[PDB]
Swiss-Prot record:
Binding site for L-glutamate: 86, 88, 93, 139-140, 190
Residues included from the entire protein: 417 to 799 of 888
Protein localization: Cell membrane; Postsynaptic cell membrane; Postsynaptic density membrane
Topology, Extracellular side: 117-258
Gene: Gria3
Protein name as catalogued: Glutamate receptor 3
Residues forming coiled coils: none
Length: 258
């Protein structure tokens, strides 16, 4: 019947259409993941309903209750059948949900307000004047928390006990902080987002240095779900036909402003 697709409000993946308040259902949203959801549904041949995840989080297991939140939690506890969003494929998640092969490749990167004297992770680690942070409850924070690499262990030790907190609830909050910090706050987010922001007015931020790692985003389904196989082949098909590239051009560069 109708599949529940959990996703998250994160531009340019999923955003409200200009006149969304006068709309209903899937028509309220637009973006890369909305188009991707549409393309996959066509191949897997299913009817679906997009649902912005309640807590607005990507997904992490609370060390306390051991309960999964975010979109990951929606799949784990059976409140959603599929998740189409910029959800990073990681080991801890692979253990509780299934991931299609990646539909996009990326890595953790550094975002600075233009003019900031920072060109690498090493630069951030060896100073204290400029504060930095990452999104809360996601793969990026876990990367730093788990790294055995000196430079990253150093950054984690600083972010872990920063006051006030340097962990934001959304990508937008991180970006806003970078913009109003007048160069005193750098943000650590995936290259896809960093690249998108650089191309959006007021064009006051930029990605510096190369990525810190290499990974990908995958369409996720509950562990053992029957949709896993069809969805994975659909992702590969769309990759082969260059549809995924068309969509990146559409939502990133066709709409550039800098
Ligand atoms: C998007 C995005 O951009 N930077 C990030 O850390 C994220 C969230 C990350 N893709 C996750 O799945 O947790
Ligand atoms: Zn609105
Ligand atoms: Zn297609």
């Amino acid at each position: 019947r109708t599949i529940v697709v959990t996703t998250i409000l994160e531009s340019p993946y999923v955003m409200y259409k200009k006149n969304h308040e006068q709309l209903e259902g899937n028509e309220r949203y637009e973006g890369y993941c909305v188009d991707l959801a549409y393309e996959i549904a066509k191949h897997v041949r299913i009817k679906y309903k997009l649902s912005i995840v309640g807590d607005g989080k990507y997904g992490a297991r609370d060390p306390e209750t051991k309960i999964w939140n975010g979109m990951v939690g929606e799949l784990v506890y059976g409140r959603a059948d599929i998740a189409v969003a910029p959800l990073t494929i990681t080991l801890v998640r692979e253990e509780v949900i299934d991931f299609s092969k990646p539909f996009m490749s990326l890595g953790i990167s550094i975002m600075i307000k233009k003019g900031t004297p920072i060109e690498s992770a090493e630069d951030l680690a060896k100073q204290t004047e400029i504060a930095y942070g990452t999104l809360d409850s996601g793969s990026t924070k876990e990367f730093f928390r788990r790294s055995k690499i000196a430079v990253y262990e150093k950054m984690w030790s600083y972010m872990k006990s920063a006051e006030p907190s340097v962990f934001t609830k959304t990508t937008a909050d991180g970006v806003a902080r970078v913009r109003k910090s007048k160069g005193k706050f750098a943000f650590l987010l995936e290259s896809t987002m960093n690249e998108y922001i650089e191309q959006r007015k007021p064009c006051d931020t930029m990605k510096v240095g190369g990525n810190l790692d290499s990974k990908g985003y995958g369409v996720a389904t509950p562990k053992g779900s029957a949709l896993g196989t069809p969805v994975n082949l659909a992702v590969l098909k769309l990759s082969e036909q260059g549809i995924l590239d068309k969509l990146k051009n559409k939502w990133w560069y066709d709409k550039g402003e800098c």
